[PDB]
């Protein structure tokens, strides 16, 4: 959601992006350590890196709990690639201590080459949605993730998913805002995730991305969303 930033905020934001040592840890949580180098990927025209995305994803989980939003599970940005190349066995332990099926919404960030996209698994509707700011379809990706769910369920609950009741859908270019440059794919993924996890229709646009980038640095610095 939109908002007007304050001087004290724009100050600390310029502070974090501005010059200084690269290894200076500016924010720590979820076993992640955001360095000034990492937060600088938020500067306009820069590609977000894994740390920033994972960090933000984890913040959505806490925001949802505290605000009475759907139970949210966010997979690491490294999960999907590991699954795609190593199969279920390679990621069997990435859900240690959690039962995916007791959650309501599962987010799976998709990193392919230099592009970022998003898969949403809504357990409440038994539906998988693929969101891509470059209008791509993700049939195969959803198919691979649905098979992962079946393996997780059979492994952890000794029960099969009822495949006949599950559906998947790739949001068309008209259903969600698209990116108009070559550097905001990571931001679209984060904002898709943000709105989707609150069951809020995705009404933001490319025009608002510069403000989102600034907002996210503050949010990451304070480990709190606006």
Swiss-Prot record:
Impact reported for residue 185 to S: Does not desumoylate CEBPB
Segments of this protein annotated with the region Protease: 33-197
Subcellular location: Nucleus, Nuclear pore complex; Nucleus membrane; Cytoplasm
Active site, UniProt feature: 115, 132, 185 (nucleophile)
PTM per Swiss-Prot/TrEMBL: Polyubiquitinated; which leads to proteasomal degradation.
Domains: entry comment: The N-terminus is necessary and sufficient for nuclear envelope targeting.
Functional description taken from the UniProt entry: Protease that catalyzes two essential functions in the SUMO pathway. The first is the hydrolysis of an alpha-linked peptide bond at the C-terminal end of the small ubiquitin-like modifier (SUMO) propeptides, SUMO1, SUMO2 and SUMO3 leading to the mature form of the proteins. The second is the deconjugation of SUMO1, SUMO2 and SUMO3 from targeted proteins, by cleaving an epsilon-linked peptide bond between the C-terminal glycine of the mature SUMO and the lysine epsilon-amino group of the target protein. May down-regulate CTNNB1 levels and thereby modulate the Wnt pathway.
Quaternary organization: Binds to SUMO2 and SUMO3. Interacts with the C-terminal domain of NUP153 via its N-terminus. Interacts with MTA1.
Protein family (similarity comment): Belongs to the peptidase C48 family.
Protein name: Sentrin-specific protease 2
Source organism (scientific name): Homo sapiens (Human)
Full-sequence portion shown in this chain: 364 to 589 of 589
């Amino acid at each position: 959601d939109l908002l007007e930033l304050t001087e004290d905020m724009e100050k600390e934001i310029s502070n974090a992006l501005g010059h200084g040592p690269q290894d200076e840890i500016l924010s720590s949580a979820f076993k992640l350590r955001i360095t000034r180098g990492d937060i600088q990927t938020l500067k306009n025209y820069h590609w977000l890196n894994d740390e920033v995305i994972n960090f933000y994803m984890n913040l959505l989980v806490e925001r949802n709990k505290k605000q009475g939003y759907p139970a949210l599970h966010v997979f690491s940005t490294f999960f999907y690639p590991k699954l795609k190349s190593g199969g279920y066995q390679a990621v069997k332990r990435w859900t240690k201590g959690v039962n995916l099926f007791e959650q309501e919404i599962i987010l799976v960030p998709i990193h392919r080459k230099v592009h970022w996209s998003l898969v949403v698994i809504d357990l409440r509707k038994k539906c998988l949605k693929y969101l891509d700011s470059m209008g791509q379809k993700g049939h195969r990706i959803c198919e691979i993730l649905l098979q992962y769910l079946q393996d997780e369920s059979k492994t952890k609950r000794n029960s099969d998913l009822n495949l006949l009741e599950w559906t998947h859908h790739s949001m068309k270019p008209h259903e969600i805002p698209q990116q108009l440059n070559g550097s905001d794919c990571g931001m679209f993924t984060c904002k898709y995730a943000d709105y989707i996890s609150r069951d809020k229709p995705i009404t933001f646009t490319q025009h608002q991305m510069p403000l989102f980038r600034k907002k996210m640095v503050w949010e990451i610095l304070h480990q709190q969303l606006l």
